């Protein structure tokens, strides 16, 4: 929190109006309080995602979003050139208020568990049409391209008569009269050439698709008759649309799918041209401002416009078929999104381990609100959050979506559910079996057995578990209210199965797999990575060396690895104002501390990154590079001007090894280790780096009281990857002196047991709160805007880990 | 050096005077951001008479500056606060203290 | 169906004929369900219908079903077991005694008409007799 | 710093309108946006 000066400063109180302005070009974020400027801005922040307005709060408030237009009347005029936010709402969806990444919601029968939500990216708004410019039309295609283009104009004019349009000198929707409707030659030739070229583009894009079209029968062109057009269909100018008619023409299913792609490419190409001109999207059309509702990539475009465009392309495809030219649909080109990992994406909800059952006959239910990918079943207490349910041996689950049973792999079983279907899960530990029922009917394997799994080893017990894929919803009923169970009576009651939570006094606590990367100690049994604590000889300081166990072998895992040291170094509260043997007075007085990293020969310095990370680093990025690092500048100044200060905040302070690799050595594998030393001055707040003794140009400045963890981000390329060297330079203290108070004045390097290497882990278990804040969101009115309210207090006892500031 | 910064406005007219009991809620934090004391946790306003030298000097000046109904942040330097000795067990030696003090009433 | 299954269990010849018939006809019992005792239609039909019969009795009747199965192990005739249960009335399970019976009785009462059912002791005793006999013979069959 | 610390804290939640804006080369979206929030009621200390 950084104080900001504004007239009549005070914590947000009733009747306060806060105006937020975002300029993506600078980029900058600015605020106004009751119309008065707030003397401070955010700038230079990252732009790698989509931005949305947000308000965060605790219990005891009522606020109102004002988004302009009919969704809230602004109390103060927006600054020049700033669009009201209500315009930003996408064509498909209507404006409303949402929570952010909720893993559950309420519902009439109970709480619904929710899987991850698929969210757009800033790139999704960039139209990416396939380029047909390189393509040259076939000679035969040249003959049809022209006449087809004229017929397409005739089709559009004919559609316009249905639109009710009449020829107009100036086109007005209110006027009902259009100048754009004219005989191809009557139409301005630069406008007509645009129609002709566009029809040519459609043949060219068919070529891009790769469909092969050679004109087949001349008689086919003779067979088609242009539909006769009435004077009423004719314009006030009297130009009459003369589209050819082809009732006989029919479209193959592969051809119909082709018509969708062509329309998409056509919408995508039209959007690119408009953007090049300078147009932009807007929910409300503004021609003078070059703002259009249509100007959004095809996929985002609304379904009605999709079908209109598809109808135009379908008619044009049918006209091409009607001439007689045969177009062969191109073979389907494989493409897999592979955007995410299955296990890290799907969220797993399980009961708390203390509820594990080691005996008896137990029952519970899971209703699939959506038909999508979910898994439901029984899991062992030591289940892992990273792994997909059932891929390992710790979970026995059922994935109805495809109709499979999962344990140590997938096997067909049962039938898929539909929306609203209830899966009843039973476990019998007396007989060591697991059973699944769908809507009260036992699910049977192809072999005909009524047990999904048999010969279950009780081991440490079992817990209810469910996994939800992105955009999925499921209602889990552990059966505390036995009357609430739907099919328990139909199946499971007489057989002697007991609802999992039958005699519990409070609802069963649950844990979900939270996909927030966190640093954890490197496991001693990790198959790929090993860390060896090396003692410090006379010539060498203490070290922590990382090696790749499985390098050079099939099944080896190679991916970005983020490592830090378990303890931080904390900068002083107040910053200072403005032989080869260390001198005693200097070494005792110095506030500078040093640690180095040795990249072994054969490991790519271009793949190594070295530096520091603040406690709040949670990025697990396989494509990491220094450009991804979060950063933002907070600038404070006086209202008249004269910026007082500008502070750069980031969570990662590192230098790339490519900077130190010499240009000649680049592209060649060196045989010499690369040593990068990191120096921090706790009193000054200054951070510097050296490479092989030489000083790097990179330097950083941090605010007082900051905590920094030594960190290395590396993509392994050799059996020996990197080594943390905890030593000292002349007249510079070792890291242990900063880390531990008892050693504050001891200059001998050392690595106590507490100091260890931790690796970033994508997912971890987290406990779902038993109660949730009750937030009411509505639309107060067209003038009032949208209303958010939360009145009931809610508190928890928080346990704080001081070193990790978590 | 005690520095006072308004968080919420007060009347601006009523100021504590010597011998007059001040009633407050306060939440105390060390400079680095750890909370050590809070009257709201106890759920009972803290009462003290100005001039009795019973609260610490930073409080004396800060509350003297504040006005009835005002909420403010007081940043109190070490030598105004307990100082070198500190408060054993609670406050470390040479610690600046940040207080969120609201002056409910004067009596 | 229960009486037919009891006849199956009692008569060794009937099992001989069902096995011979299934083998000779080569008919697949699994096809009907979707050679072996489980595949045997005689047993499969009773297994399918058994929940219907158990639905007849009440949770308190379970205590008596246990003793009825014990008598059937003792080989007492059907009427003999009926009279044993007749004289052993107070052995009915007690709702207050165990928590599980509490929620089982909750369900039993919630379903309509079951409270009206079992009002007369004679129907109770006959119902427990029938279910107990069926369960006992199921036990003998499932046993090697 | 050595012992785990405990305290009571308020639960906090966030709310957004489904409005998304970004910048990408060739993007169709507009650059500058504006919105407002009016505070009707606030309880400075509903809890500790
Ligand atoms: N996005 C588009 N893709 C393909 N053809 C288009 C597109 N927009 C318009 N056309 C066609 O281009 C010709 C000229 O456009 P139109 O007559 O609709 O003019 P306008 O109403 O002034 O502009 P617009 O409708 O494009 O905003 C007409 O045949 C129209 O069907």
DSSP chain C: -HHHHHHHHH-HHHHHHHHHHHHHH---HHHHH---TTT-HHHHHHHHHHHHHHHHS-HHHHHHHHHHHHHHHHT--HHHHHHHHHH--TTS--TTT-HHHHHHHHHHHHSTTTTTTT-SHHHHHHHHHHHHHHHHHHHHHH--
Q: Which residues of C touch A494 (CB under 8 A)?
A: 50-51, 54-55
How many CB atoms are located within 10 Å of the residue A346 CB? Answer: 23
Per DSSP, the three-state class of A667 is coil
Question: Strands, DSSP E only, in A181-324?
Answer: 212-215, 225-226, 244-245, 280-281, 291-292
Residue C54 contacts residue C131 (beta carbons within 8 Å):
yes
Nearest-CA distance D24 → chain B (Å): 39
Phi, psi of A598 (to 5 degrees): -105, 115
Phi, psi of A675 (to 5 degrees): -110, 120
Torsion of CA A730, A733, A734, A735, to 10 degrees: -140
Q: How far apart are CA A129 and CA A271, in angstroms?
A: 9
Q: Which two tokens stand for residue A465?
A: 């578990």
DSSP A86-116: GGGS-SSSPP-EE-SS-SEEEETTEEEEE-P
Q: How many CA atoms lie within 13 A of A451 on its CB side?
A: 11
Residue nearest to atom 8 of ligand 1 (CA): A270
Bridge partners of residue A166, in order along the sequence: A177
Cβ of C54 under 8 Å from any chain A Cβ?
Answer: yes
Q: How far apart are CA A805 and CA A20, in angstroms?
A: 30
Q: How far apart are CA A453 and CA A431, in angstroms?
A: 11
Nearest to A298 by CA among A336, A271, A337: A271
Phi, psi of C3 (to 5 degrees): -60, -40
Cβ of A180 under 8 Å from any chain C Cβ?
Answer: no
Nearest-CA distance B48 → chain A (Å): 26
* Nearest-atom index, ligand 1, CA of A181: 17
Q: Which two tokens stand for residue B97?
A: 């203290």
Q: Which two tokens stand for residue A162?
A: 């249905």
Q: How far apart are CA A391 and CA A401, in angstroms?
A: 16
Residue B43 contacts residue B102 (beta carbons within 8 Å):
no
Cβ of A502 under 8 Å from any chain C Cβ?
Answer: yes
* All partners of chain D with 3 or more CB pairs under 8 angstroms: A, B
Chain-chain contact of A8 with B9 (C-beta, under 8 angstroms)? yes
- Active-site residue numbers of B? 26, 36-37, 56, 82, 99
Burial class (CB in 10 A: 0-12, 13-18, 19+), A388: buried
Longest Cα–Cα distance in chain B: 39
All residues at 6 or more sequence positions from B64 whose CB lies less than 8 Å from its CB, including other chains:
B15, B16, B50
Q: How far apart are CA A414 and CA A418, in angstroms?
A: 13
Phi, psi of A481 (to 5 degrees): -95, 95
User: Would you give the end-to-end CA distance of chain A in angstroms?
Assistant: 17
Bridge partners of residue D33, in order along the sequence: A22, A83
Q: How far apart are CA A352 and CA A769, in angstroms?
A: 12
Q: Using the mean position of ligand 1's atoms as its centre, give its distance from the Cα of residue A25 in Å.
A: 31
* Nearest-atom index, ligand 1, CA of A152: 29
Q: Using the mean position of ligand 1's atoms as its centre, give its distance from the Cα of residue A287 in Å.
A: 14
The owner of tokens 């969120």 is B100
Q: Using the mean position of ligand 1's atoms as its centre, give its distance from the Cα of residue A781 in Å.
A: 37
Nearest to C59 by CA among C135, C22, C114: C114
Residue A437 contacts residue A423 (beta carbons within 8 Å):
yes
DSSP chain B: --EEEEEE---SS----TT-EEEEEEEEEETTS-EEEEHHHHTS-EEEETTS--S-HHHHHHHHHS-TT-EEEEEE-TTTSSTTS-BTTTB-SS--EEEEEEEEEE-
Resolution limit, Å: 3.1
Cβ of C106 under 8 Å from any chain A Cβ?
Answer: yes
Phi, psi of C84 (to 5 degrees): -55, -50
Residue in chain B closest to D1 (alpha carbons) equals B34
Chain-chain contact of D45 with B40 (C-beta, under 8 angstroms)? yes
Phi, psi of A713 (to 5 degrees): -110, 125
Q: Which two tokens stand for residue A108?
A: 């009439």
Chain-chain contact of D45 with B35 (C-beta, under 8 angstroms)? no
Q: Which two tokens stand for residue C60?
A: 């308190």
User: Would you give the end-to-end CA distance of chain B in angstroms?
Assistant: 27
Q: Using the mean position of ligand 1's atoms as its centre, give its distance from the Cα of residue A195 in Å.
A: 9
Interface test with D, best of A65, A91, A299 (most D CBs within 10 A): A65
Cβ of C13 under 8 Å from any chain A Cβ?
Answer: no
Interface of A with B (CB under 8 A): 3, 8-11, 13, 573, 705
Q: How many CA atoms lie within 13 A of D6 on its CB side?
A: 2
Query: Taking the CA atoms of chain D, what radius of gyration do you get in angstroms?
Result: 20
Chain-chain contact of C100 with A444 (C-beta, under 8 angstroms)? no
Chain-chain contact of C34 with A444 (C-beta, under 8 angstroms)? yes
Torsion of CA A624, A628, A629, A634, to 10 degrees: 180
Residue A292 contacts residue A185 (beta carbons within 8 Å):
no
DSSP structural state of residue A5 = B
* H or E element at residue A25: none
Q: Which residues of C touch A503 (CB under 8 A)?
A: 99-100, 103
Dihedral angle sign, alpha carbons of residues A350, A351, A357, A361? negative
Q: Which residues of B touch D7 (CB under 8 A)?
A: 35
Q: How far apart are CA A66 and CA A62, in angstroms?
A: 13
Nearest to A319 by CA among A187, A183, A155, A185: A155
Residue in chain A closest to D2 (alpha carbons) equals A802
The structure's method of determination equals cryo-EM
Q: How far is residue A246 from each of residues A145, A214, A227, measured CA to CA in Å?
A: 17, 19, 9
Residue A569 contacts residue A682 (beta carbons within 8 Å):
yes
Peptide bond into A99 cis (omega under 30): no
Tell me the three-class secondary structure of A29-71, residue by residue: EEEEECCEEEEEEEECCCCCCCECCCEEEECCEEEEEECCCCC
Chain-chain contact of D48 with B40 (C-beta, under 8 angstroms)? yes
Dihedral angle sign, alpha carbons of residues A350, A356, A361, A362? negative
Q: How far apart are CA A519 and CA A563, in angstroms?
A: 8
Is the beta carbon of A270 within 6 A of some atom in ligand 1?
A: yes
Q: How far apart are CA A429 and CA A631, in angstroms?
A: 54
Residue A789 contacts residue A577 (beta carbons within 8 Å):
no
Residue D48 contacts residue B42 (beta carbons within 8 Å):
no
Q: Which residues of A touch B32 (CB under 8 A)?
A: 573, 705
Residue nearest to atom 20 of ligand 1 (CA): A180
């Amino acid at each position: 929190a950084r104080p900001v000066t504004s007239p009549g400063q005070h914590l947000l109180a009733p009747e306060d109006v806060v105006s937020c302005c975002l300029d993506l070009s600078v980029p900058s974020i600015s605020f106004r309080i009751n119309g008065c400027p707030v003397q401070g801005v955010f700038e230079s922040f990252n732009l790698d995602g989509l931005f949305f307005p947000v308000v965060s709060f605790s219990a005891g408030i009522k606020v109102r979003f004002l988004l302009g237009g009919r969704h809230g009347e602004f109390k103060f005029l927006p600054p020049p050139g700033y669009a009201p936010c209500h315009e930003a709402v996408l064509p498909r969806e209507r404006l409303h208020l949402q929570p952010i990444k909720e893993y559950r919601r309420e519902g009439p029968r109970g709480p619904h568990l929710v899987g991850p939500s698929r969210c757009l990216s800033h790139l999704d708004f960039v139209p990416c049409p396939v380029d047909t410019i390189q393509i040259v039309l076939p000679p035969h295609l040249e003959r049809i391209r022209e006449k087809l283009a004229e017929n397409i104009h005739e089709l559009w004019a004919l559609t316009r008569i249905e639109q009710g349009w009449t020829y107009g000198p100036v086109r007005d929707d209110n006027k009902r009269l259009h100048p754009c409707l004219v005989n191809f030659h009557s139409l301005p030739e630069p406008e007509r050439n645009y129609n002709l070229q566009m029809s040519g583009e459609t043949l060219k894009t068919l070529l891009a698709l790769g469909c092969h079209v050679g004109m087949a029968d001349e008689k086919a062109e003779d067979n088609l008759k242009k539909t006769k057009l009435p004077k009423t269909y004719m314009m006030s100018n009297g130009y009459k649309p003369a589209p050819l008619d082809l009732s006989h023409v029919r479209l193959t299913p592969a051809q119909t799918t082709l018509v969708d792609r062509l329309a998409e490419n056509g919408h995508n190409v039209w959007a690119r041209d408009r953007v090049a001109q300078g147009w932009s999207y807007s929910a409300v059309q503004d021609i003078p401002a070059r703002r259009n509702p249509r100007l959004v990539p095809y996929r985002l475009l609304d379904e009605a416009t999709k079908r209109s465009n598809r109808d135009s392309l379908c008619q044009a495809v049918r006209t091409l078929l009607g001439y007689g030219y045969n177009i062969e649909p191109p073979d389907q080109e494989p493409s897999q999104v592979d955007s995410q990992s299955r296990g890290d994406r799907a969220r797993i909800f399980r009961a708390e381990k203390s509820y594990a059952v080691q005996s008896g006959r137990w029952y519970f239910e899971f209703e699939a609100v959506t038909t999508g990918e979910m898994r439901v079943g029984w899991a062992r207490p030591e289940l892992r959050p990273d792994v997909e349910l059932g891929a390992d041996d710790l979970a026995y689950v059922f994935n109805g979506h495809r109709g499979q049973r999962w344990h140590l792999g997938s096997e067909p079983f049962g039938r898929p559910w539909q929306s609203g279907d209830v899966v009843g899960c039973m476990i019998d530990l007396t007989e060591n079996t697991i059973i699944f029922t769908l809507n009260g009917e036992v699910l049977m394997s192809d072999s005909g057995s009524e047990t999904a799994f048999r010969d279950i080893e009780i081991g440490d017990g079992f817990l209810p578990v469910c996994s939800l894929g992105p955009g999925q919803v499921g209602h889990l009923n552990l059966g505390q209210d036995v009357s609430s169970l739907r099919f328990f009576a139909i199946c499971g009651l007489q057989e002697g199965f007991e609802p999992f939570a039958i005699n519990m006094q409070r609802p069963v606590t649950t844990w979900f797999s939270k996909s927030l990367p966190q640093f954890e100690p490197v496991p001693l049994e990790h198959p790929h990575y090993e860390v060896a604590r090396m003692d410090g000889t006379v010539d060498t300081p203490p070290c922590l060396r990382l090696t790749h166990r499985t390098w050079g072998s099939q099944n080896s895992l190679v991916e970005m690895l983020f490592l830090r040291l378990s303890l931080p170094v904390q900068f002083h509260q107040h910053f200072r104002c403005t032989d080869n043997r260390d001198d005693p007075e200097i070494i005792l007085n110095t506030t500078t501390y040093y640690y180095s990293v040795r990249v072994f020969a054969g490991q790519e310095p271009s793949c190594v990154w070295v530096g520091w990370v603040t406690p709040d680093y949670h990025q697990h990025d396989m494509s990491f590079d220094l450009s991804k690092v979060r950063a933002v500048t907070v600038t404070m100044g006086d209202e008249q001007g004269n910026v007082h200060s500008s502070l750069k905040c980031s969570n990662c302070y590192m230098v790339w090894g490519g900077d130190f690799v010499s240009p000649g050595q680049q592209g060649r594998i060196s045989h010499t280790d690369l040593v990068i030393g990191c120096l921090v001055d706790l009193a000054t707040g200054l951070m510097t780096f050296t490479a092989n003794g030489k000083e790097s140009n990179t330097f950083f400045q941090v605010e007082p009281n900051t905590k920094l963890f030594p960190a290395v981000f590396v993509l392994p390329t050799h059996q020996n990857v990197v080594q943390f060297e905890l030593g000292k330079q002349k007249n510079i203290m070792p890291l242990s002196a900063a880390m531990f108070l008892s050693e504050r004045k001891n200059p001998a390097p050392q690595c106590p047991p507490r100091l260890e290497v931790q690796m970033l882990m994508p997912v971890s278990w987290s406990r779902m709160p038993n109660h949730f804040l009750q937030v009411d969101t509505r639309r107060a009115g067209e003038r009032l805007g949208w209303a958010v309210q939360c009145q009931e207090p809610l508190m928890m006892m928080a346990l704080h880990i001081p070193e990790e500031n978590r | 050096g005690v520095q006072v910064e308004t968080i919420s406005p007060g009347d601006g007219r009523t100021f504590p005077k010597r011998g007059q009991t001040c009633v407050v809620h306060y939440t105390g934090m060390l400079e680095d951001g750890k909370k050590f004391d809070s009257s709201r946790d106890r759920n009972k306003p803290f009462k003290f008479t100005l001039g009795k030298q019973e609260v610490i000097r930073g409080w004396e000046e800060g509350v003297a500056q504040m006005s009835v109904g005002q909420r403010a942040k007081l940043i109190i330097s070490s030598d105004y606060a307990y100082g070198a000795t500190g408060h054993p067990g609670i406050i470390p030696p040479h610690a600046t203290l940040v207080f969120d003090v609201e002056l409910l009433k004067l009596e | 169906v229960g009486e037919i299954f009891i006849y199956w269990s009692k008569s060794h010849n009937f099992k001989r004929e069902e096995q011979n018939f299934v083998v000779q006809n080569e008919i697949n019992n699994m096809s009907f369900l979707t050679y072996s005792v489980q595949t045997s239609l005689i047993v499969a039909t009773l297994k399918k219908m058994l929940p219907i019969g158990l639905n007849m009795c009440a949770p308190t009747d379970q205590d008596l079903i246990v003793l009825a199965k014990a008598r059937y192990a003792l080989k007492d005739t059907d009427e003999e077991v009926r009279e044993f249960l007749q004289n052993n009335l107070n052995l009915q399970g007690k709702v207050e005694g165990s928590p599980s019976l509490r929620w089982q009785m909750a369900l039993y009462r919630g379903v309509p008409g079951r409270e009206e059912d079992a009002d007369d002791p004679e129907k109770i005793v006959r119902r427990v007799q029938e279910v107990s006999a069926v369960l006992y013979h199921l036990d003998q069959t499932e046993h090697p | 710093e050595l012992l785990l610390q405990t305290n009571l804290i308020n639960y906090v939640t966030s709310i957004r309108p489904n409005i998304f804006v970004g910048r990408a080369e060739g993007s169709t979206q507009y650059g500058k946006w504006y919105f407002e929030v009016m505070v009707d009621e606030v309880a400075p200390f509903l809890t500790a």
